[PDB]
Amino acid sequence: RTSQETADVKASVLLGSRGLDISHISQRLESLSAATTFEPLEPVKDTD
């Protein structure tokens, strides 16, 4: 229905009228997909 070629811009006109930035939230969601917090510390499936 909507081309992605205009999406984040039109969403930012609509939601920026209410004080939201789509770009800082996307650039956070990029860091939230690069932040390797992980525990290689305990023994996978010791059991049965």
CA 8 – CA 4 distance, rounded (Å): 8
6 or 47: whose CB is closer to a second copy? Answer: 6
The one-letter amino acid code at 15 reads L
CA 14 – CA 19 distance, rounded (Å): 10
Site string for a second copy, 5-44 (x = CB under 8 A): xx-xxx-xx--xx-x-xxxx-xx-----------------
CA 46 – CA 34 distance, rounded (Å): 30
34 or 44: whose CB is closer to a second copy? Answer: 34
Residues forming contacts to a second copy in the complex (CB under 8 A) are: 5-6, 8-10, 12-13, 16-17, 19, 21-24, 26-27
